[PDB]
A and B are shown apart, each in its own frame.
Chain A
Amino acid sequence: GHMGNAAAAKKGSEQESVKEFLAKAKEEFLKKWESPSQNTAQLDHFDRIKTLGTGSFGRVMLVKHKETGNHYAMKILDKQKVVKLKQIEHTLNEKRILQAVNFPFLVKLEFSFKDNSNLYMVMEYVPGGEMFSHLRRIGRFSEPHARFYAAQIVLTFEYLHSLDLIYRDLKPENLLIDQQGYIQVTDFGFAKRVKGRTWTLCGTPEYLAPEIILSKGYNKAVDWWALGVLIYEMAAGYPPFFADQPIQIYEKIVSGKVRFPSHFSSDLKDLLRNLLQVDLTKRFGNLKNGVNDIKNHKWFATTDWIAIYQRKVEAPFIPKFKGPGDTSNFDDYEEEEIRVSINEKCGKEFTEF
């Protein structure tokens, strides 16, 4: 076979230990999922510094906690915009999931609260910037560099999917680089606890699996498709289904045809053809062997999965950090003062937040 006796037994034991880890992680998650935290701070506890990124419902700002002086990233959502965009359920998903998960590559939620106008989620500040910026600046990542990041996403999805959580918005814009060069996944706005199928048409066009575009009930395998898109974009510098307008992007995705740069290794192309697989009976991550089809693929042969989890692998890139609260690794955005009404808006819709 491919593995000798020693290698086979080591791999088997490793895979059993994964099951043991995930069973304990589920027990811990369920305790927090059934008894969530709420109202752990208030707005006047923080000084607002600078906008770090924007979204449809608001922005994320660097804030400084007045009492402790610690810096945080505060996501601000305008309740009125959330209701109009039918994102009430999604925003409740985001907060509930973030408060209950625990993994080295998932951003940590520290506080959450609401006022008359807005919802607030206060997270650890990750100063190294978005992967997106670094990728666009350099052009592309070499295969070992891309593989280091991809391995962290594989482990993060193995964790999330074991908890019946689908992520649904993988892309470089949502992956921050920490002070050690490791990934922090942010933006749980589309994450959802799903036992089997779900039906919402949501995500980012370039990263959507064909079954989403085709209005099928879909499952966690959409995240494994998106991993294929991410790995391709990291290694090529552009995604595999690339067009100016969403309708044109969707047409390319459902055709299934993928072309690869001549510099892609054959191992990489083989992995990507198995992730970017339109037939769900053949897509890696959706088969009997589960995540192991990905983790044991030749492209990951040099990956020490435990060492990645333990953050003991030397990172390919360490962001420059000029001190606590430095924002040099983030782009600039138009600033807008946070307005808080004298009247409570959308109170009944956000009671559980």
Chain B
Amino acid sequence: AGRTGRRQAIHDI
């Protein structure tokens, strides 16, 4: 199982 929708970038950790 995992993320199937659009994935947002991360700015830290």
Residues in chain A within 8 A of chain B (CB atoms): 55-56, 85-87, 90, 132, 136, 169, 171, 173, 189-190, 201-206, 238-239, 242-244, 246, 249
A206 touches B1 (CB 8 A): no
- Closest B residue to A252 by beta carbon equals B2
Residues in A with CB closer than 8 Å to B3 are: 206, 242-244
A204 touches B12 (CB 8 A): no
* A167 CB, nearest partner CB in chain B, Å: 12
Residues in A with CB closer than 8 Å to B8 are: 55-56, 204
Q: How far is the CA of A295 from the CA of B6 in the complex (A)?
A: 30
B9 touches A190 (CB 8 A): yes
B7 touches A205 (CB 8 A): yes
Q: How far is the CA of A132 from the CA of B2 in the complex (A)?
A: 15
Looking at the complex, which one of A132, A136, A203, A239 makes contact with B9 (CB distance below 8 Å)?
Answer: A203
Residues in chain B within 8 A of chain A (CB atoms): 1-4, 6-13
Residues in A with CB closer than 8 Å to B11 are: 56, 85-87, 90, 201-202
- Closest B residue to A206 by beta carbon equals B7
Residues in B with CB closer than 8 Å to A204 are: 7-10
* A179 CB, nearest partner CB in chain B, Å: 23
B12 touches A202 (CB 8 A): yes
Residues in B with CB closer than 8 Å to A55 are: 8-9
Known: A243-B1, A244-B1. A189 touches B6 (CB 8 A): no
Q: How far is the CA of A201 from the CA of B2 in the complex (A)?
A: 22
Q: How far is the CA of A87 from the CA of B9 in the complex (A)?
A: 12
Residues in B with CB closer than 8 Å to A206 are: 2-3, 7
Nearest 3 interchain pairs by C-beta: A242-B2, A204-B9, A204-B7
The 22 sampled A-B contact pairs (Cβ below 8 Å) are A55-B8, A56-B8, A86-B12, A87-B11, A132-B6, A169-B9, A171-B7, A173-B6, A189-B9, A201-B10, A201-B12, A203-B9, A204-B7, A204-B9, A204-B10, A205-B7, A205-B10, A206-B7, A238-B2, A242-B2, A242-B3, A244-B2
* B11 CB, nearest partner CB in chain A, Å: 5
B10 touches A243 (CB 8 A): no
Residues in A with CB closer than 8 Å to B6 are: 132, 173
A56 touches B9 (CB 8 A): yes
Residues in B with CB closer than 8 Å to A243 are: 1-3
* B13 CB, nearest partner CB in chain A, Å: 6
Q: How far is the CA of A239 from the CA of B5 in the complex (A)?
A: 12
Known: A243-B2, A244-B1, A244-B2. A202 touches B13 (CB 8 A): no
Residues in A with CB closer than 8 Å to B12 are: 86, 201-202
Looking at the complex, which one of B1, B2, B4, B10 makes contact with A203 (CB distance below 8 Å)?
Answer: B10
Q: How far is the CA of A173 from the CA of B13 in the complex (A)?
A: 21
A202 touches B9 (CB 8 A): yes
B1 touches A246 (CB 8 A): no
B7 touches A136 (CB 8 A): no
* A156 CB, nearest partner CB in chain B, Å: 19
* B3 CB, nearest partner CB in chain A, Å: 7
Residues in A with CB closer than 8 Å to B10 are: 201-205, 246
B4 touches A136 (CB 8 A): yes
Q: How far is the CA of A249 from the CA of B7 in the complex (A)?
A: 13
Q: How far is the CA of A87 from the CA of B1 in the complex (A)?
A: 31
Q: How far is the CA of A288 from the CA of B8 in the complex (A)?
A: 34
- Closest A residue to B1 by beta carbon equals A244
